[PDB]
Design a protein around this nucleic acid. Structure first.
Lengths: 58, 193, 99, 148, 51, 203
RNA sequence: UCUUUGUAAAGUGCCUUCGAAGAGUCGAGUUGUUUGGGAAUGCAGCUCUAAGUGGGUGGUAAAUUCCAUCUAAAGCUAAAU
RNA sequence: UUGACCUCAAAUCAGGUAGGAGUACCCGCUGAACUUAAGCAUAUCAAUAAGCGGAGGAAAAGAAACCAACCGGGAUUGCCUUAGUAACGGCGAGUGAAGCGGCAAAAGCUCAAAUUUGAAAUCUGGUACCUUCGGUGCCCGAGUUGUAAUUUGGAGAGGGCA
């Protein structure tokens, strides 16, 4: 919803999302909407960032 | 097996029909149980009229076109026209039909007037009142009967132009019959230069 | 639609005052939305094309519309779906040439 | 009742009225309509010609309500006008105040001309009408107004 | 599923009822029924509605 | 929201993304047991639209059933009757493969109640489905009245009697002229129109 | 006998913008079985496999043009039985 | 080196649940033949008996991907009727519904998919207390791959005006 509204100043994506379906559209979603995105190592590192076990995006 | 001059009969009793035979011995018993259930039910809702105000409605087919009957519920168009909300009406006994439409003014007015007749003749107790019991009536249908509307007066003048009403039926049938064919003829006359 | 006022014929029926009530919201159900389009565009641009849809594209380019519509009908259910599929395979043919 | 039946009177007689030679056996000629083409042909053909075979066209999902068209004959037309006003209408036979006879409201679809109405004018509202029934109605001074 | 109740025409019922009421006022039929009306001053016996 | 994307992508089954995921996933699921516990649903959108919610007491099982017809279980194909009943081979099971899949799971996790089931994959021998089960005696479902209806005993083994989505589809429970044999139940309808109703005053 | 709830709950009128609505599912072929459903009533196996003024239905198969209705592939529900 | 995450496991780990019975009625699956056809193979018996799985006091069904074609009805069920009818059938023997109408009873709805993001507002369990079919702490957790509030097509949501 942040990307669709263009409300995202920067978005990171995890690569360890075991069902890739949840994150596959994210780079293409981030592109057409023109928001900067980086694919990053660690869904667990994302989880630590957001005080979780896993977040798959920050 | 087949013998002298009799109508040929079809008595479907070649299955184990004798296992599925129901005698309605409890006709009298069921009627008593039903009246008791009506009696107890009316007591539990002691001031309420034991029925929901049902609407007026024209019967579907060409066979029953002439008849008007009690339907399921009032159209949301009718209820808004009266001045109420479906959520409110369902609590004061005015049954509401969401699937029904109004494509006909006389059903529209007859149902709206049915609604104003209901409001003026019912009293809703405030939730924090004294419950002034008001001589409950057990039938909202009997309170607002479904009367067939009158069509015209019992005697009018005779006017005539020379149609017989028979030519107009033969013409209407025949015009309908060849209408599709007459389009294709007119299509050809449209393409013939 | 105004009835002819008699029990036979094209518009047979009682002549009444028509009202044409306000449309039901379930009638609008089939309409597209800019929400659903934005998702479908971004999903097609990432998913790709099915094999028969690729074979349909070549059939349009080489064999033509008649042959393409024939295979689409075999691959899909009916004539109606076939034409709609070929029609969208033609829009992608025209569009991809530009970009 | 059981006491009036011939079963009571057959008590003491060996065969119960069924004969000694050709007895009462179970199903000597078959069951139901068996052998209708073969050994019951002499009965079928005599009493039920037309029984075997098919005749016309099929109609799937036939709704009987479609064809609902009860007929009202002209000799019965004046029975639709109520009894109290009927005598008044015949004796005061006149245009400009003819009774209105709503035939559909009574439960009839078509009006047939079985004939001999009085010459009292009548307004006849109908769905369908027969040629003669409308002819006879005009000759009585009245009219047929087609109702849907 | 033996037939237990037997339907009688409504009008015939009321015909037989009217016959039974009519036979009430006949002294000869009431004695013939064995209804000990020898000491009854008249038949049909009608009492004031205090009873 | 992201589920709309999952919905639109999942319809693109023949595309290379889904076809590739199909081949690797179907191999992985086949290597596991014919019924095994899925930690998470493979599709968030399908599980939740059918009634799953990511809360304690909500379960998902992955199951594979064998495909094809149902061979008539007769020794040496001998049916012992009329030729019309002599068929053995090309006879079709009247329930769905989704139904047997969730009946087999319902016996495995007999403490739960089958909420639904859905297709995940298929190959030549096995059709793969995910079953949604709801723990009725988990207090998170005993409370939260959106879900506790399944705790009521009238919903014991819904998959067994045919009360799931595939169960209602197989019994033909639908409105319309097309389901006249199966509206109130085929056997209920049959017994109703094969009963001789006799009133006290015979009609 | 047991507070008398704190800056909250829902309903209505007018006007603008929108308004997601269920997929190996629908649908088609075939097979079997079933049905009163008959160029196939339902169901099921296999093969194919969609869409968004779309889809389903409108009891004779098929193009073309309309029209009338409903909104599937998710779910609960007393009574009359 | 030390902590996670995912998946998988183990414990007489803490607390639960299922299994069997009965089975008249109910929901499914599976499934005959005798018989009738004066023989018999389709048919019929019968979508029955027998077999198997699963419930409740009722079950199923159920608020239309309905019926219709009308001047339109309006969830489901059941009765009367439609009707031994439309229709199916070696079109033989036989079989065979539904719409409308009258009535009994009538009750409605809710999830998914939405733009809480100025605050996961959500829930189990453990301990503590209490006025124990539960409430309030606190804590570990579960959970953002989405648990609450809000909407369900009959609408609704955003924003402006009592």
């Amino acid at each position: 919803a942040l990307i669709e509204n263009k409300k995202a100043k920067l978005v990171l994506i995890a690569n360890d999302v075991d069902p890739i379906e949840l994150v596959v559209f994210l780079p293409a979603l981030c592109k057409k909407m023109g928001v900067p995105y980086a694919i990053v190592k660690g869904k667990a590192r994302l989880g630590t960032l957001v005080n979780q076990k896993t977040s798959a995006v920050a | 097996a087949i013998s002298k001059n009799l109508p040929i009969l079809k008595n479907h009793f070649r299955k184990h029909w004798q296992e599925r035979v129901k005698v309605h011995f409890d006709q009298a018993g069921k009627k008593v149980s039903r009246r008791n259930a009506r009696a107890t039910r009316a007591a539990k809702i002691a001031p309420r009229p034991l029925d929901l105000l049902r609407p007026v409605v024209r019967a579907p087919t060409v066979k029953y076109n002439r008849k008007v009957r009690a339907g399921r519920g009032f159209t949301l168009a009718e209820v808004k026209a009266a001045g109420l909300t479906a959520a409110y009406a369902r609590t004061i006994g005015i049954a509401v039909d969401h699937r029904r439409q109004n494509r006909n003014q006389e059903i529209f007015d007859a149902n709206v007037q049915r609604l104003k007749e209901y409001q003026s003749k019912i009293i809703v107790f405030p939730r924090n009142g004294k419950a002034p019991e008001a001589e409950q009536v057990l039938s909202a249908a009997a309170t607002f009967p479904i009367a067939q509307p009158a069509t015209d007066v019992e005697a009018r003048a005779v006017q005539d132009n020379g149609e017989s009403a028979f030519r107009t039926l033969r013409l209407a049938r025949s015009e309908k019959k060849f209408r599709g064919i007459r389009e294709k003829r007119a299509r050809e006359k449209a393409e013939a230069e | 639609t105004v009835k002819t006022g008699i029990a036979i014929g094209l518009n047979k029926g009682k002549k009444v005052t028509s009202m044409t009530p306000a449309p039901k919201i379930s009638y609008k159900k089939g309409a597209a939305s800019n929400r659903t389009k934005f998702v479908r565009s971004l999903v097609r641009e990432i998913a790709g094309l099915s094999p028969y849809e690729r074979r349909l594209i070549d059939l349009i380019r080489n064999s033509g519309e008649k042959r393409a519509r024939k295979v689409a009908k075999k691959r899909l259910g009916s004539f109606t779906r076939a034409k709609a599929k070929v029609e969208e395979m033609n829009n992608i043919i025209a569009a991809s040439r530009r970009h | 009742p059981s006491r009036f039946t011939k079963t009571r009177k057959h008590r003491g007689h060996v065969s119960a009225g069924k004969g000694r030679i050709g007895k009462h056996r179970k199903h000597p000629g078959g069951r139901g309509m068996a052998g209708g083409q073969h050994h019951h042909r002499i009965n079928m053909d005599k009493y039920h010609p037309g029984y075997f075979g098919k005749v016309g066209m099929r109609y799937f999902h036939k709704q009987q309500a479609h064809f609902w068209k009860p007929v009202l004959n002209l000799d019965k037309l004046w029975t639709l006008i109520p009894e109290d006003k009927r005598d008044q209408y015949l004796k005061s036979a006149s245009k400009e105040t003819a009774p209105v006879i709503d035939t559909l409201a009574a439960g009839y679809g078509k009006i047939l001309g079985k004939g001999r109405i009085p010459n009292v004018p009548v307004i006849v509202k109908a769905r369908f009408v027969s040629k003669l029934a409308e002819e006879k109605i005009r000759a009585a001074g009245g009219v047929v107004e087609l109702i849907a | 599923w033996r037939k237990w109740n037997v339907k009688v025409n409504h009008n015939e019922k009321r015909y037989a009822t009217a016959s039974a009421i009519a036979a009430t006022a006949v002294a000869s039929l009431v004695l013939a029924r064995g209804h000990r009306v020898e000491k009854i001053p008249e038949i049909p016996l009608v009492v004031s509605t205090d009873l | 929201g992201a589920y709309k994307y999952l919905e639109e992508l999942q319809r693109k089954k023949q595309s290379d993304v889904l076809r590739f995921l199909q081949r690797v996933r179907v191999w992985e699921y086949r290597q596991k047991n014919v019924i095994h516990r899925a930690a998470r649903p493979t599709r968030p959108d399908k599980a939740r639209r059918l009634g799953y919610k990511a809360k304690q007491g909500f379960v998902i099982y992955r199951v594979r059933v064998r495909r094809g017809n149902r061979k008539r279980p007769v020794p040496k194909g001998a049916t012992y009757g009329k030729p019309t009943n002599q068929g053995v081979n090309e006879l079709k099971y009247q329930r769905s493969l989704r139904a047997t899949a969730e009946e087999r799971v319902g016996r495995r996790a007999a403490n739960l109640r089958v909420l639904n089931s859905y297709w995940v994959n298929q190959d030549s021998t096995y059709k793969y489905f995910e079953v949604i089960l709801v723990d009725p005696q988990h207090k998170a479902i005993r409370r939260d009245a959106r879900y506790n209806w399944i705790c009521d005993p009238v919903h014991k083994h819904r998959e067994a009697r045919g009360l799931t989505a595939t169960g209602k589809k197989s019994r033909g429970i639908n409105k319309g002229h097309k389901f006249n044999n199966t509206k109130a139940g085929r056997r209920k309808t049959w017994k109703r129109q094969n009963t001789l109703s006799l009133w006290r005053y015979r009609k």
